[PDB]
Design a protein that fits this description.
part of a larger assembly; 17 chains; mainly beta; 49% strand
């Protein structure tokens, strides 16, 4: 049942499990597609990215703000199954990274019939 | 000094104030550019948008999730100055809406010299 | 000693350990034998099922109820030994699923003599 | 409005009220159809049954368990209406007993019109 | 399910329910068989008795005591079924009164079969 | 002033002290005269008895009960004076055992006059 | 070091220990010299007395009172040495009983020299 | 009655209200006259300035300090009356800025006579 | 390590320690250069000054204020080294007094080499 | 009723009382039969022993341990009856010492009959 | 660093780790050498045994006891290294079981030199 | 196991128990050898002494003090064995009284062999 | 994400993770380079060392100390990746041990591209 | 007014101040005159001594003890006046060290007359 | 008895006091011998040093760390005696600085004899 | 800044500090001018006096009292400057002692000019 | 028994009652004999006085003070007896006013004899 999330910075994760794969959704609003580093192996995925901070002309002042300032953020995740890093896909749109990880064959649960 | 935020759903705001305008940044990760409705007048801006929920094949199950499910979200904001809705600009990239509101002339603080 | 239960919905589990196998008992009252999905591999078993809700004619009203309404329920379990999914058996009677999982050879503790 | 449940052992009840009858649902997972004793009269129903305990070979040990051990369990219920014990029906499938109790004529609320 | 005990003085009760009767056991240690008053009707039984207090010669003093002094004690009990006061029996031995109350016909639950 | 009570089971004691003896009253409701074992020596008395439990036909069920179930009960008591076990008397009626213990000569307080 | 006081009613005690005796002072205000019963043996002294209550003509009412009403009062005391009841003296004046108890020979501590 | 202060950094304010004007005093110790920016309009005044930090030769170390380090500080204030930014005066001496704001004509309360 | 501050009134201090001297910074906003009294000797410095209060025409009222009213304020400080009062310098600008105190020769720590 | 245990070190005791003797069981796991010292007299028994500590090669380290380290342990017990030290027996097997102490004749409670 | 103990009953464990093996000490006082079952595999050892309860003639009564009554007890342990079940040794003396488990080659940490 | 200390004043005790005697150590700093009174009998020892208070010339004042002022101090001790007062020894040096009390023959525990 | 530290004694750890290796920093002030034992295998590293205690001539006394006295200290660490013990390097300077552990090939996360 | 006590071990101090000297009393029961080390200088006195521990034959056991075991004890005291170490006297009797310290001339307060 | 420590950063100190000197031990792990500044005078010593921070290639990330980051650290200590800065020695090895400070003659306590 | 008051009894102090002296006021109501002892030296003043207690004829009783009874009272004060005991003056009128202490030359703070 | 004190300012009172008069003591330290106003009538006395405040040259500052500043103080007291204001006396010395009030004849308790 094991899933271990860990890292720094704001990054709402979501783990979807299918029969033959695992989907991982992450919220990286403000982060630039090319600032994201994605790599995984075995049963752990690591998402690390950097989102630059709000640039303000000397004239402006931040009257108010709920957006976290930290620039470097990431998460290493322990998936509940080993996967094929080799066939992983990933899309990043509207600040949302979505990673598809095919389940490794050795981690594909096989059925049991009832009678 | 008045700034009144209010509405429903997750939407980290940020208000930047310059001498002749007001910048408003909002985090709408996952929201579709054309699902955003932006309108303002006087001293209040309203950002309302809808982000569709994570679609999962019947086969998948959400093993874990930190992403809020609510679909319809918005915020009406009371800015600390009246603005020219007419000349407002807005960009939406990487899940981040950024609105530029020119300060109305009547709300432009004028200087006072010290001696 | 590790055993990790996890999932959603009401489903009292029971894990029995023998020398060469592991028995797992689950309470799925109201669930339909063919609505149960059983599969396992390595050291983890997954029981997922759906029990339809109490259907009431428009005329009736639920005057009182201790029965949980949720329809989709499941549990993935981490057994304390690897098993042969291939030879697992399972019976479902009187709302009680009982799964027999033969211990994998590599997980069969071997004796040590005292003198 | 009176409904009085009472007895011993785990047995999630559910009382459905219709215009001319009362349905009572009980969760008796693991209990054997012929170990259930059902009888009622006036405005009270009594469900008493016994579910045998998990039998384990001397070799096995209960590594973990959420299933209550008590064998003899029951509930006497006070229904919100008198009923015809004589015409009561009952089905027991998938650990779920469902009893239909026709409302006694003297307990059938009659309508009142508004104008 | 209703059973209402009430009265004054120490008198441990016990209510046993059979299919066609109700047994009631009461602890009246020190009480004299002929100081007991037993009467009942409908669904309520009343046991009232008086136990004289420990008589001590002027010479003696009660060095210590866990025995309640109150002399007049009783309990009126609401049984879970109407009974035939007419056929009630009662035995009193070793400070223990035991009353047998035949269930009234109108209170005898009738069976319901399952299929 | 020493009096030490100790043992198991419900047994309200009462110790009466006279000039030349000690009376001990015990509540053994439900206990059978011949199931009581009484013996003492020096300054300690021991009362041990067994009261059989309420026998119920398979048909009956204990709907409610304030009577303790434990069968074997007893108490060893340290009296405030040595006594003549040899001349102790004892009566048991209506669930009440009453023991008379003649004070030993060596424990008979002798008077002191005031002037 | 043992001294055990016990009894009922208000009776401030005081124990004085000498080398060859033990003095006991008791406050029995309002008690009548001839209502006092004094006796002791071995290592325990017993003081029991009765002070009659304030008699008031029907005309009077107790507007206020700090004097305890209880009539029968006493105390049995465990002295730190065995004594010769036989040679005990006692004086009672101004509501104060004072008892002199010669230490028994077997309880007279004997000296040990230091060097 | 409205007065809204808001901003960042240490800056004790004081608002004095006259019949035809409003005085505002601010403590900007350590701040340089030409580092102060003063501007206002309508009913809000904004004071923003920057005080450089204590410069210490590499040789020195701050053994102790109650002086806040923040460099950029400011406050935007909502005055209880609209004012003529145009005729505002301001003096800055001994770390104290004092601003005189003539009340706008439309905000000059007019008298009411009592009889 | 000793540094003892003490006195009355608001006066944020700051003590900087160099190898051959001690710098002391104090916030005296609103205080007049010539109202400051500075003197020191041995290892203690004393700063005492008076700042006049905000003068308000009878017409004005203090609508709000965070500026402390007390007029006479001061602090006597125990420096962590004896100093040469004789060569102390002092500057007072923008409400900030800064005192330079040459360390006394006898208080100049001398080096120790490590090998 | 008196039983006084006291001493140091871990040593679960158990006192069994028969009519003519007293059994005392003690848990001395790891203690060597010949390291046990047993002696008693009157109404008190004393069990004192020493268990050597776990010897570990310099190479090993105690990764974890629930076994108390103390070496010298013992208990002096006050039995509820005087005994014949002279006829006491004792067996020590599997780390369990079991002592049989014949009750002294003077401590054998004699019977009292009830009628 | 992982070590997982788990099971039922009183059984103080101790785990000693050497470079090439693991020692496990267990306190099974009162347990019979031939009632102990020892087996292990991979990185987990299981110790299960049964100690019969104190047998008492009908005449005796357990006046006092700190010895746990449970008969069947055991523990499955997760060792911090895989081991060779095949070469495990075990001695049981004075209620103390001591098991020697040779570390598996694949679990023997290899050195790293510092410079 | 009984040991009862009691008395007044500061006097740290220490009781050592041998096979044939009992040693008692007491801290009587400042007390004068000839101000100590030692006597005992049976199973109780009594140590009473008086230490004069610090004498100060009128000129001096007690600037500070942790030494208790009370002059008369003592303790009566209940030893865990009867002793021969007759053969007791005692040494008093450096404010430390040490008493040797030979155990009485009747209190000398006799051995019990194990097999 | 798993990292498990464990051991005894003061030893501030620091784990740095690179793409192809893992660095581990440990503070072993006062420890002697040749008193350090470093070994690792799989995914766990073990650092064990001994620092001798401050030697003080009989003449000296430790007036004050924040340095922990314990001599033998160590930590076994679970790294987040398997490593090649074989190619580990290590430097120890200024009380700081620094270990470089090359990541095992099987633990080297591989990239995933986004589009 | 300064007096600073500090050190380890039990040692009740007492400081008496006269016009021309300072007396210091210390309780060193059990300490040997020649195990005491006394030295002082300026305004601080240091008392350090060692009292050997109670020696017990292997046969004896410490049944009870209020005497602190620590062997090495001491206190360094800061006197409220500088003194002439040179003329200090000291007596040690009955476990009580008493030191007389002549006040240094420079610390002898001189009088002031009132009128 | 005075010892005053003060400064910033992690630096476990230890002060050893001899008859003619004072030893000071400090833990400066990671600090470079030539980055340490040592100087003292009178009765105060000052240790100030700087330890550079862990340098990490852009590729690495600090997965975990118990090592404080602050670079500049120091402590000024008030020794309990004046010393000869001139003859102070100092060694720095294995992150441990050890300073020897000869006591000043004027601070060398001189003896006092007891009689 | 140091001022240390200390002593016993009620004596409200007041310390006034001038540029060249220190005034000390003390409330000694009821104390007799010739019962006051005043002396000081260096930086500490000592005021000690005795006020006799209210003398009452045997006939009178103190119905109520807020006046402290203690007779001997005093305070030793640490002044913030050394003084010339030699030139101290003192007046005592209306229960108020007032002492004038000329500051010692070495304690006279010297000025520092600001520019 | 009535005595009512009331007023403002610090003024410790004391009421002494004799058979024929009442003495009242008041602490008015610092108050001037001629600033005291004393008058009474019936059963109430009133003491009102004013003590001027400590006058300090501009040069001095109150470094510390426990003396209350309030100038005007007083107390009106309700005596437990009516008195002859006419014959009252009063002395004021050393800050202590002492008033003698002759009891009025009507308030002089007269005796009652006991028999």
């Amino acid at each position: 049942t094991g899933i271990q999330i860990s890292g720094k910075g704001f990054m709402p994760i979501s783990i979807i499990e299918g029969d033959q794969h695992i989907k991982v959704i992450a919220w990286l609003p403000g982060v630039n597609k090319e600032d994201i580093i994605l790599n995984a192996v075995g049963d752990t995925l690591e998402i690390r990215a950097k989102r630059s901070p709000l640039m303000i002309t000397e004239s402006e002042r931040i009257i108010y703000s709920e957006i976290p300032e930290e620039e470097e953020i990431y998460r290493t995740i322990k998936l509940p199954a080993t996967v094929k890093e080799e066939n992983a896909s990933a899309k990043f749109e509207n600040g949302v990274l979505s990673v598809i990880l095919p389940k490794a064959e050795s981690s594909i649960k096989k059925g049991i019939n009832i009678e």
